[PDB]
Structure formats: structure tokens, C-alpha cells
Amino acid sequence: HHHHSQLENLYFQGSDWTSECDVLVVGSGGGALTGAYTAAAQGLTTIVLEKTDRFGGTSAYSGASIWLPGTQVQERAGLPDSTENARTYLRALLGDAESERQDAYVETAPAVVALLEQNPNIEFEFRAFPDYYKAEGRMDTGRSINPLDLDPADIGDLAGKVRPELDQDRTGQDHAPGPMIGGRALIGRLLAAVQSTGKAELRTESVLTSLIVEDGRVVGAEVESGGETQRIKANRGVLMAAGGIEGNAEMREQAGTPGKAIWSMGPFGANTGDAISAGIAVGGATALLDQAWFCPGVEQPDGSAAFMVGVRGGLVVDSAGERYLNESLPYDQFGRAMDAHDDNGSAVPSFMIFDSREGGGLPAICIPNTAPAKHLEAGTWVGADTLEELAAKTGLPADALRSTVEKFNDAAKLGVDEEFHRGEDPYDAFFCPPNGGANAALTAIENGPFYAARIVLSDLGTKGGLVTDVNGRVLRADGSAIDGLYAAGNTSASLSGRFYPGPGVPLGTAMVFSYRAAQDMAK
Ligand SMILES: Cc1cc2nc3c(=O)[nH]c(=O)nc-3n(C[C@H](O)[C@H](O)[C@H](O)COP(=O)(O)OP(=O)(O)OC[C@H]3O[C@@H](n4cnc5c(N)ncnc54)[C@H](O)[C@@H]3O)c2cc1C
Ligand SMILES: C[C@]12C=CC(=O)C=C1CC[C@@H]1[C@@H]2CC[C@]2(C)C(=O)CC[C@@H]12
């Protein structure tokens, strides 16, 4: 499947429009469905194309934490925060680079939240999760909001169409027993809201392949559904919110993107840069293709990874058996530090070192969560009764590994880490239950057996793609808009550059620029 552009005139020699809509949405992530809702709610006929047999993509896997600050939702919680406070935080991290999109992000958040909560299927609440950088306007508790838990019965036939959590989806399973939470709830509610409008068609196994141009304007796109090709006309526009290049090893190697397709937490085979490709084919510029939403990943027997988040013990060594980062860093800064320290394989993989404090468990949240016994049969993890035997089994220098652990244990006994300042930040302390020691993030590694887990450079999607303006319009290298073409989420180059400012920025940006694209199409 290549994403070459089809000219209207050339197609007129043979075929014709299968269907017509005002707004064609490609993808069914948080952005896609927010854009679809915005379009359909104000009377525009809308078609949503999902490539796979399940709506939601990585947005479904998410915890549905959303960085939409200064809204009616944080007002109800009485949060000491504002549009201007969130605007300062972004300015302090990102600078003047993309300041117009920074302004539009923070200024439009309130309207996106107000439009969505109006729908009986949608309600959010503030949930504490710290912002990720020391800077003016940081919220030590967070300012991010989450959809309310959703009883799958309230949405009928849509619950079985929603992609399940990673602990189910990569083991051939559907939703696990309780309610829909995190991204399952975000996608269930957005699907039900889009459907409530009576102006939207929701399609599974409908793949975008090529955009249709007349006289340089996008007028529609051919979508493959069940062996047959269809030609869908879009009177107002095509919103492309179909994710990034995360699943395409060839586009990543070409762009110089660190990590690997097989380490991405995107749904296997889903996000293969189809929409970025179709956008370049009609003259769209690209930026930041070497950038991803990075995270450490626990290497799996099958060669894939698990998102390692909320670290609360252990330490991490490079291939010399030495600490080189604060292991408690927010996952994107952790991942960037693995890549920066990588000297042809000294940091990728890294080795997470831990003891039996958690009964053999690795001291973090791993998504998905493979059983220790499985990692040990497979050799992704190794165990031993001594650090000397552990260094032997991993090929780590034994004397260095022993010094590293003895020095980390002295730091745990003292309650400060001289070397990397672990535990001296509200993000670091957030995940840690009280221990009987001075710093909750620093626990002496001394209760046998001892484990070494392989850590790789995973991602939560790439963040490079098509250049967009404040209204989600796709731009050519010259700054001019391609008429009828919008992109959002990881189809579009993030305003965040080399930064992951706080929880919910991927979904928050996606939802705001999808809303703004719909509004621009309404005219
Ligand atoms: C465990 C986990 C937790 C996370 N938690 C959060 C969080 O709380 N908040 C947050 O902001 N971010 C979070 N993230 C990151 C976030 O999920 C993603 O970066 C973000 O959702 C990307 O959304 P998207 O719209 O770019 O892509 P997706 O949500 O993946 O949507 C893309 C969709 O487009 C479809 N598609 C692809 N190609 C085509 C095509 N050719 N035609 C039609 N459809 C196509 C795909 O199948 C997919 O369904 C988390 C990630 C993970 C893995
Ligand atoms: C770190 C995270 C991810 C990316 C992002 O952007 C925002 C968040 C905050 C919410 C957590 C989520 C990851 C998954 C978590 C840990 C859960 O399973 C419950 C709360 C979720």
C-alpha cells in the first residue's frame, strides 16, 4: 500500500464517487473522534474511517489523562491554575518555537471541554498526576483531566468495537471483567457522542490509501473496505488523525527516529505512516520525524516491549554496570537519556537491577505485565543469589556492578542520591509507597535473589509528521495551505518539539487541533 495521490480527472476516466460527506475523518483516536464530534454536532455529515477492526488505536490503550488546562473541569475541582499559568509552563519549556500553536492549544482547551461535556455521553474529572519539568507554571499535582469510568452497557454495540487494554490486546483477548477506564472510556464515550449526533457514519476495516486532488485542492480520498476500493467525496475537508510512523521500521530508519517499530506500544500493524505519506504525496511538508514520545520498555520474550512507568525501586546500569540517569525521571526524559548515553549499545539495552522486595516483581508498572517466570524462561530477565553471579549471567562487569549497588545502597541509607538526585522531585515521589527509610524513591537493594531486566527505547507513538497551522491545515514547504486537508495527533508535527511537558499532552493537542480543524471546515 503506497499513498500516491489520485487526480480527479484521471479517475473520471473510469470510476466515480462511491459516497459523499462534508467531513471525512481518517483514524478513530481521541483527536479523530473529537474532530468527528465537532463536525457532526454542528450539522456536517461525517464519515470516520478506522483501518483495523477496532476503534481507538493507541488512544484506547492510554490512561486517558488529557492536558486541557483552565477549563470548567478544573474550576469544579477548585484548582489553583489558569490558561495563563499553563501558557507560562509551555513558554518556559518550548520557547517562541510554535508559540502560535501553544497559544491556540491553551486558549481553545476550555471550548473543547465545554462542547464535549454538553453531550450526555461525556464527562471528565481532574485526576492528580504531576507535570514533568521544573519550570514556572508547573503543577506539582498536575492539571490533567480523565473521562469517567464507563459501564460498557451504556453504549450498546460500540463496546465490542473498542480496542482493549494492552494486557488483553497483545494476548488475543477482549475487555477484562470490570468497567471501561482510561482510553477504553475515552473512546467509548467519544464513539457514543459521535453516534448521538445522527450525522456520522463509523466504519471499521476501512483504510485510507490515496487522497484525491482536483486543481491542487483535496476533494476526497479512496478507502479500501473488504477487497473493494471506494471513492469518498469530502465537500469541506479530510481530517487525517491516523497516528504516526511508529509501526513502520522503514520510515523510522529513513527519518533517524531512535527506537524500533517492534518496541513501539502502538497497536501492532496499525500506525504505518499511511496518512503522513498520503499528505506528502499531495505536497505536505514534514518536521520532527526523528522525534517520538519516548519511554523505557521492558524487553519481552517475543522481542517487543512493555511501557515501564512509575518506577519505585531498583536502579539502572549501562553495559559497563554503572548508573547514568535518575531512574525515576518522567518516561520521555528517561528515554531521551538512554539515547543520549548510547555508545553503539552501551545504553540500549540498559539493565534494571532489583531484589525480592516485591516477591520477584520488577518495581514499576509494566504495560503489559508479563509474568517474571516467563521473562526468566526466555532470558529477558536473569536471577541469581549474588550480584557476582548476576553480573556473570548478564555479561556486566562484576566489580563495577557491585560498587554501583553498594553506592546506591549508601544513598538509600542516607536518603539522598549525590550522583543523580533521585527522589528530589514530586514526579519521582508520586509512585512510591512509604518505605521505613528517609527517601521513598531510594530503597537499598539487598534482599535476595537479585534480578536484571533488559530495558530498551520504547515509544508511545512518534510525534513528527505533517506541518500544520493553528487550524490543523496541512502546509507545503512554502507555508501555503493545501485546501481541504487537515491533520492532528501524531499525523501532524507536535508543537511540543523535543519536550513531553506533562501527562495528557499527546491526547490534549490531538483533541484541540481536531476541534479547530472541524471549526475551520464549518466556515
Ligand atoms: C499505555 C499508554 C498510556 C498512555 N497514556 C496516555 C495518557 O494518559 N494521555 C496521553 O495524552 N497520551 C497517552 N499515551 C500516548 C497516546 O496514547 C498516543 O500518543 C496518542 O493517543 C496518539 O493518538 P493518535 O491519534 O496520534 O493515534 P491513535 O490513537 O493510535 O489513532 C490512530 C488510528 O488511525 C488508524 N489508522 C492508521 N492508518 C489508517 C489508515 N490508513 N486509514 C484509516 N485508519 C488508519 C489506526 O488503526 C488507529 O486506530 C499513552 C500511550 C500508551 C501506550
Ligand atoms: C503516565 C500516563 C501515560 C501517558 C500520559 O500522557 C499520561 C499518563 C498519566 C496517566 C497514566 C498514564 C500511563 C498508564 C497509567 C499509569 C495507568 O494505567 C493509570 C494512570 C495512567
Ligand closest to 64 (CA) is: 1
9 has binding-site annotation: no
Phi, psi of 466 (to 5 degrees): -70, 140
3-class DSSP assignment, residue 391: helix
Mutate to test the pocket of ligand 1, among 507, 509, 511 (most ligand atoms within 8 A of CB): 507
475 with 483: CB under 8 angstroms?
A: no
CA distances from 431 to 165, 309, 476 (A): 21, 9, 44
Q: 49 CA to middle of ligand 1, Å?
A: 14
Q: Indicate whether residue 487 lines ligand 1 (CB < 6 A).
A: no
Q: Which amino acid is at 510?
A: A
Nearest CA among 267, 218, 85, 223 for reference residue 517: 218
The neighbour count for residue 284, using CB atoms within 10 Å, is: 26
What is the spatial distance between Cα 451 and Cα 150, in angstroms, rounded to a whole number? 39
Q: Indicate whether residue 330 lines ligand 2 (CB < 6 A).
A: no
What is the spatial distance between Cα 217 and Cα 209, in angstroms, rounded to a whole number? 17
Q: 476 CA to middle of ligand 1, Å?
A: 25
Dump the DSSP string for 211-229. EEEETTEEEEEEEEETTEE
- Ligand 1, residue 129: give the atom nearest the CA: 8
**Cell numbers placing 519:** 471549526
Ligand closest to 267 (CA) is: 1
Mutate to test the pocket of ligand 2, among 59, 65, 186, 366 (most ligand atoms within 8 A of CB): 65
The neighbour count for residue 480, using CB atoms within 10 Å, is: 11
Q: Which residues neighbour 473 within 8 Å (Cβ) at sequence distance 6 or greater?
A: 481, 482, 485, 486, 517, 520
Ligand closest to 265 (CA) is: 1
Residues in the chain: 523
Q: 61 CA to middle of ligand 2, Å?
A: 10
Q: Whose CA is nearest to atom 5 of ligand 1?
A: 62
What are the residue ranges of helices labelled H in 256-330? 274-281
44 has binding-site annotation: no
CA distances from 472 to 482, 491, 521 (A): 11, 10, 10
333 with 324: CB under 8 angstroms?
A: no
59 has binding-site annotation: yes
Ligand closest to 278 (CA) is: 1
Q: Indicate whether residue 398 lines ligand 1 (CB < 6 A).
A: no
Packing angle between helix 83-94 and helix 99-118, nearest 10 degrees? 140
271 has binding-site annotation: yes
Q: Whose CA is nearest to atom 21 of ligand 2?
A: 63
Q: Indicate whether residue 309 lines ligand 2 (CB < 6 A).
A: yes
- Ligand 2, residue 507: give the atom nearest the CA: 6
452 with 355: CB under 8 angstroms?
A: no
SS3 content of the chain, % helix, strand, coil (to 5): 35, 20, 45
- Ligand 1, residue 267: give the atom nearest the CA: 30
Q: What is the H or E stretch that residue 416 is in?
A: none
Q: Indicate whether residue 241 lines ligand 1 (CB < 6 A).
A: yes
Nearest CA among 260, 50, 145, 183 for reference residue 505: 145
- The residue behind cell 554496570 is 321
What are the residue ranges of helices labelled H in 119-270? 166-169, 182-196, 249-255
166 with 367: CB under 8 angstroms?
A: yes
Phi, psi of 49 (to 5 degrees): -105, 115
**Cell numbers placing 246:** 511508529
Cis peptide preceding 80, ω within 30 of 0? no
β-pairing verdict for 19-26 and 228-240: parallel
58 has binding-site annotation: yes
Q: Which residues neighbour 96 within 8 Å (Cβ) at sequence distance 6 or greater?
A: none
CATH 3.90.700.10 fits 292-459, yes or no: yes
What is the spatial distance between Cα 414 and Cα 418, in angstroms, rounded to a whole number? 10
Q: Whose CA is nearest to atom 4 of ligand 2?
A: 503
Nearest CA among 19, 365, 7, 357 for reference residue 167: 365
Q: Which amino acid is at 425?
A: D
Q: Which residues neighbour 160 within 8 Å (Cβ) at sequence distance 6 or greater?
A: 174
